[PDB]
Structure formats: C-alpha cells, structure tokens
Amino acid sequence: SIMQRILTVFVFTLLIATVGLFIGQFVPVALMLPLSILEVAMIILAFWAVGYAFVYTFAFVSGITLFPIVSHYASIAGAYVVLEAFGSTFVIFAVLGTIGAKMKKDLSFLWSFLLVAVLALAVVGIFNIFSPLNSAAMMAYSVIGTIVFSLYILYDLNQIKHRHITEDLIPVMALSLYLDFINLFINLLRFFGIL
C-alpha cells in the first residue's frame, strides 16, 4: 500500500507544484522572498508528523518559488534546457527509485553520509547567498547536488521498502521524496544551463 499510497501522494504534490509554477509566473517578485523564507521554515519544521494540508501547502509554495530559477535559465539558455532537465530528472528518479524498490541490502548506513552531504550542500548554498560563487563553481556544486540527490532518491525508496513506516507517516515520508525530487531537478537543470 505504501508503495501505492505514498507514491500517489508524491505525484499529487508534483501536480500541485506544476499549478504553483503556472500561477508562479503571475506572482510578483519581492513577495517571492518571504515565500522562500516560508519554504525554508516549513522544511526545518517538518524535519525537526505533518499532515496532508501541510504537504500540499508546501507543494503550492515550492511550486511558486521555483519560478525564478526556471524562468531565468529558460530565458538565458533556452526552454529546452528546462524541458530536458525535467525529463532527465524524471528518468533518474524512475530508474534509481526503482532500484530503491528492488535492492535488498538495507541502505540504512549511508543515511549518515547522505545527511552530511545535504548539510554540505546547505553550507555552500548559504555561503552562495551572501558571497556568490563563479559559474565554474556553480557547475561543480551542481554536479555534486545531482549525485547526492540521486542517492537520496535511491535511499528513500529503499527505506520505503524496508523501514517500519506506519500509515500515518504517509505525508512527511512523501515530502522526503518531493524534496529529493525538486533538489535533483534544480541541480540537474542548472547543470544543463551552464553547459
């Protein structure tokens, strides 16, 4: 059920994200920033169990505040960069995720590394907001992002197969997927753009 319920939730959050992007282009800037802060707040709070309403709210908000990067890279490198990026994200998600659904060996150890990795990304990202890195650094940083988050997709579906995830845990667990998805998309899209 979990591999049928949680997945459905994830895809639903994808739909809501899409609506958030479509609406997001109409959303005036300077109001994007507090939505971003709200996004970080929801992330920190959820993983400090959040219900469906929380998840979908964050889905809409995240769907909105991703518009700047989307429109930027589309308007500098072509709409294809965005599309190819999206499809690529989809494929890596499907393949590596499926591997998560099949491979027996409990990938619970790497949880340490993975965490250390995301935190690392966070560090760089934080630094990046204050003192921006050159394109050369953005490329590397992006590649690392793609790797770490592909790993997080894999690991996540593996834990869906293994760990005693109660029914009620459905939303926040599906949220763990959505973040792993969105983050890959960005780091994979930005990769295509710099090229």
| Residues 6 or more apart in contact with residue 46 via CB below 8 angstroms | 54, 58, 172, 175
Contact 60, 19 (CB under 8 A): yes
CB of 45 to Pt ion, least distance (A): 16
**C-beta of 105 vs 134, nearer to Pt ion:** 105
In the region spanning residues 22 to 81, those forming contacts with Pt ion, defined by CB under 5 A, are: none
Size of the site for Pt ion (CB under 5 A): 3
- Span from 24-32, 41-49, 63-71, 170-178 in contact with Pt ion (CB under 5 A): 170-178
User: Which CB sits closer to Pt ion, 82 or 107?
Assistant: 107
Interface residue with Pt ion, options 41, 103, 122, 137 (CB under 5 A): 103
**φ and ψ at 31, to 5 degrees?**
-115, -10
**CB within 8 Å of 157: residues ≥ 6 apart:** 96, 97, 98, 99, 100, 101, 177
Query: Which one of 3, 37, 122, 140 is in contact with Pt ion (CB under 5 A)?
Result: 3
CA separation for the pair 25, 64 (Å, rounded): 8
Footprint of Pt ion (CB under 5 A)? 3, 103, 173
